[PDB]
Amino acid sequence: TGGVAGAADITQGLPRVIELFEARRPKAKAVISEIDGVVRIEETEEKLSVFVESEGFSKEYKLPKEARLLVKDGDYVEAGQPLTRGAIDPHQLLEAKGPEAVERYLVEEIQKV
Numbered sequence: 001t002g003g004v005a006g007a008a009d010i011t012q013g014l015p016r017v018i019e020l021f022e023a024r025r026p027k028a029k030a031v032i033s034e035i036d037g038v039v040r041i042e043e044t045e046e047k048l049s050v051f052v053e054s055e056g057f058s059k060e061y062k063l064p065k066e067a068r069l070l071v072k073d074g075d076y077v078e079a080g081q082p083l084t085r086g087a088i089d090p091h092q093l094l095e096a097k098g099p100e101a102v103e104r105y106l107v108e109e110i111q112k113v
Ligand SMILES: [Mg+2]
Pocket: 005, 006, 007
């Protein structure tokens, strides 16, 4: 779905149902949180950046210009939670929140349509 132009973010109709049954890398993906911790954001001109961290560790996340961020400087983000806005890659959610997560995401993301 969609077409390469400026910022076309999601995928509707059957096109999507295809992108869902067939595990695929959405056009406008959403970087998930491999780590369940707290949020931190930065200012510099070119690229934004969201950092998740626990008393254990922190992870750097590259969020280029188009990425509209759902999360804010401050609260917790469970593993595989949406840190970018839009679509998620099942494989990633598989690795992050688990199978049960992907499974549960697939079903519900499909019925959405
Ligand atoms: Mg545009």
